[PDB]
Amino acid sequence: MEVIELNKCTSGQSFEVILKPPSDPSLEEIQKKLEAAEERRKYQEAELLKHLAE
């Protein structure tokens, strides 16, 4: 039951009590993901318009 790293100031204090010792995607790759999903939306809408054109 040891108390360590006691630091005190006008507004409070802090300390540590020990009970027992122990035993990314680049900017380029993010743009491609966004543009790839945008392309799949454009393809699906094109097929819808093509279906409506028939």
Place this chain on the structure above:
Amino acid sequence: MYTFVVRDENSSVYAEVSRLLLATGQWKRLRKDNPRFNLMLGERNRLPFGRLGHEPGLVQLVNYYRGADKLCRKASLVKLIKTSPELSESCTWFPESYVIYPTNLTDEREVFLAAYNRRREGREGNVWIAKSSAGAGILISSEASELLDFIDEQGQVHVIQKYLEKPLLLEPGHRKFDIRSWVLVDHLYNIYLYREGVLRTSSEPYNSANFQDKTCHLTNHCIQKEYSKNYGRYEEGNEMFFEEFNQYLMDALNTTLENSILLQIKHIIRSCLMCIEPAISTKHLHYQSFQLFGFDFMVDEELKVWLIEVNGAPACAQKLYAELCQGIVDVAISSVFPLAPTSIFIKLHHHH
């Protein structure tokens, strides 16, 4: 209309409970995956406790205490008794036990041999038994070499504990036996002891000079009915009930089952369950638990009671299924979900 699900089809006890619940016309059984239930008769292994108590407007209750395995595992029980101050290592009602991991895997090998060598040098009885939870796999021997070598041939954790060489032998027959007590703990953590126990007796004479033939040393109902030749000779199905056993203790020993044995049993049950109460209590939990336990005791020739093990999913004697299962419904299920005596239980009072 209350709702419940069944997730253990192999449970004889809760099959009857489920049968009784439906007989009231006030309980409805749902598919085993329907989360809108009031009561779960859960599976034995890997019960998803984390998914309970998150259904708005449903008080949910399960028939298992999360964490009670500490009591119902051979190795776990040994560790709990040796490490819990409430039970202490000097606990006088639990046989000297040691956890032994096979060498192909802490471990108490050296500690066991030290106590073993002490008995061998002091001319004392030095017969130990080795067992585990992954058994139907038991070996009884007086040589430590055979006990440790038998565990290494296996691959699961084992326990070596002292073998009660001076058991209480029924007469006529000169035969061993064990006592099974059923204990129900409700959501409020009341400890109810079923008034009816069963002595699972051996139909063979106890022989202390031959631990090779294990039919007269192991009182398991399956071993007596498979390898014993006197099964059902003295009592039906090698099952003597408390009425007969009490009358015996009066005729032969001039004492009663309550005084000589039942006080020690009640004390042991309380000690074990009160010990783990802080770790498994569901008092302030988002769901509630109850559970049925099967305690197994051994009685020696001095009328001292010893705890053998605790079973978390026990079965019941055929003659007692109706009474006990109805009791489970009254005190464990209807106490939380009431329906629109002379209790069959003995309340073991205690401090929470």
Place this chain on the structure above:
Amino acid sequence: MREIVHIQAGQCGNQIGAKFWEVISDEHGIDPTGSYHGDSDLQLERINVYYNEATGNKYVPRAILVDLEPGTMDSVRSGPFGQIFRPDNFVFGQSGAGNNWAKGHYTEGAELVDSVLDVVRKESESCDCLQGFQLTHSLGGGTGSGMGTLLISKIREEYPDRIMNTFSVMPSPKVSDTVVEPYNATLSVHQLVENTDETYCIDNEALYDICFRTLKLTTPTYGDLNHLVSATMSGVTTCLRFPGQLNADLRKLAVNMVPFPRLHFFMPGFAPLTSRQQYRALTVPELTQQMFDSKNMMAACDPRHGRYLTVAAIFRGRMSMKEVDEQMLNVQNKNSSYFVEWIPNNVKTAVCDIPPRGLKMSATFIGNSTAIQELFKRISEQFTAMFRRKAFLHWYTGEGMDEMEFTEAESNMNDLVSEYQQYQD
């Protein structure tokens, strides 16, 4: 500002749409001249969703009245609130559609559709952020059914990313005008399966039975049936017309109610339904029991024959939201066998403080149930009884249609029935 454009087509569509605007105009405090005279700011909070604001603080419904004959719309213009509609939003022809889907969809309707789309485009161009469209129409006639589904197809082509919503009156032999209604309904249902996001199925037989058995109306009229539709349309749109975060806009409602794109046909319900004991206060348990009772639903389908994929409930009036949650949870937990278990928490509840006119409180029910297949089964059976003998087909082939188009509409609806069946098991 999430504007919705309203369209009403044909006799049924215009008569039901007229009453709809009559009801919600009263709720929002808009009088027959478009002037606001309410006493609560909640009325104007979301007023721009269905009304445009003109000069002088006038509120003009964002509604487009379409028909192939002038008769029904002349009545609307001469009706109670007839003067509130934008005069330029009346688009009509003179020929009529003769209860013929082909005339509304391929011949007469085609000649008039472009002028309707000019009005739609005009209303959309003034919307800050258009949510989508809602259409009222019947499926058994020619204009609302044939030209209605034609409008939907062309609206989707011009606004592919907007939500398309319909209130569709399904025909019934018990409340029937002509024998060809199963033909017109089967042809429309296929169009709806493809080009709408949400369709409220309103069965005229359910409306009839409610008027006769529950409301104790000896001889129901179309007016009586439309009173039910009005009250129901006001209930299901309460989420859109007042402050709230549940089913707040059309797309969010669709995302919570439609798990599969073709299964977007809902059974609506309303409570109370009291015969004239009409002053009795109705408790929350009573509102909930009735709202889920089949006798209070308007698709003429028994919910206990299928399973609910999703449910949306709306309670109106000053009441205990605590007691609302309790009774709703009681219905789900006491009948969870009728709710699919593979869509967790698929029953959503919403409260609104403003009750309907002349009611302390009410409840509107919106269910996506597989039981709706019974409705399409009935239609399919009536279709095949005539089509197997090619009866009355000449009315359609005379308008350029071929028998193959009927066979395909038949298969498409039987596929829809099969699709519901697989999710009911």
Place this chain on the structure above:
Amino acid sequence: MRECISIHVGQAGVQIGNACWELYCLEHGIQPDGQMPSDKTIGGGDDSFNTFFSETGAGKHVPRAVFVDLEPTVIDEVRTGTYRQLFHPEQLITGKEDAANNYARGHYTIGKEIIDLVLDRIRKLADQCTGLQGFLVFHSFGGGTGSGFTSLLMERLSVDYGKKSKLEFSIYPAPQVSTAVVEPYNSILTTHTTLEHSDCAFMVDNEAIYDICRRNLDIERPTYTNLNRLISQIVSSITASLRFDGALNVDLTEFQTNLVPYPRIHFPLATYAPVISAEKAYHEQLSVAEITNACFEPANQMVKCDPRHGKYMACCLLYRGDVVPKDVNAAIATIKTKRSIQFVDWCPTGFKVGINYQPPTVVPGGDLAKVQRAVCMLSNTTAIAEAWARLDHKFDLMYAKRAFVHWYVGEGMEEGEFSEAREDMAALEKDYEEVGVD
């Protein structure tokens, strides 16, 4: 002094953000107009509170905050609310139509068109900082914006601010206050794509806050206002160390050092006590032992779960009010002899304690009563994995039928991203089990 920028995304983030900054102002004595009489350095300074507030020459203290929502109704509340004067228009970003509870709509469709604008507004705040630490990001799991746009924003922040820490305050979905059926989908999708970009995430389960409001505050049907004021008290207790003089958790880096030894397991459980109703006649003030003991009761945890059946990796005790170290150690000793507290064998069995003498501030007219002392315990338990299990199970039930999947595919997302995200969660649950169970 080093600055912290707060980012609020979606309805949940914005409304919680609004409640927090209200509390921050009452705590630091800042008026609704931004003036702070106690600040004797006009137009500048490097005080602790300056980590969250900048200053104008006129003496206005302006939050270092950005509010983002794909729909204007919630952020319009801030523009005309009590603290409309604190923020300037550049800090409030709103679109015209929301993500419709659709992760793919917030992440791909709408997120792609607004991400560069949001980054620009953040850059303007970053350019005012002499030494920016990182970001605090508030959002829900269930909303389409909170889930979908947050994950995109976190990806870009790791690119544009590689060396900066990022903490989360995430709202875990609860059916009692939700009308969206697809929220398990959104939750798992956003956790998968945010996991590698978040250094420390504080999850708050609306179910927990809801029950605390009904049980302790005697609110029969809590509203978002009730929930958010309680949540902002807990948030305030967590960020106090960055805004006040002290030595524990003085910068975002210390949060990870003291709470997250393993980077993937970065979800500390928050527990708060006491929560007392203001409508009460008058409450007996609880002691250090009683409020500390309360930190090990499931009823006051931000996520309902059983820490008795997990293993601790770290534990901070954050006290506010009349508390001296002597009483903290006394109550801790007593709790060890009664409670089930098992640490992982590769971590010390200890507690980091911080004490701020200023008792919790309560918003006038709010639901919480003034208390002489309070504590917030931050513990990294494997028990919080119960929450992932619950969520992943609901995911499995719907995805097995592909229910609602078409809404996501229709916005440009591939179906494979469902299973990809689910498999990441399955690995996450396995990590918790390897650390916690024997």
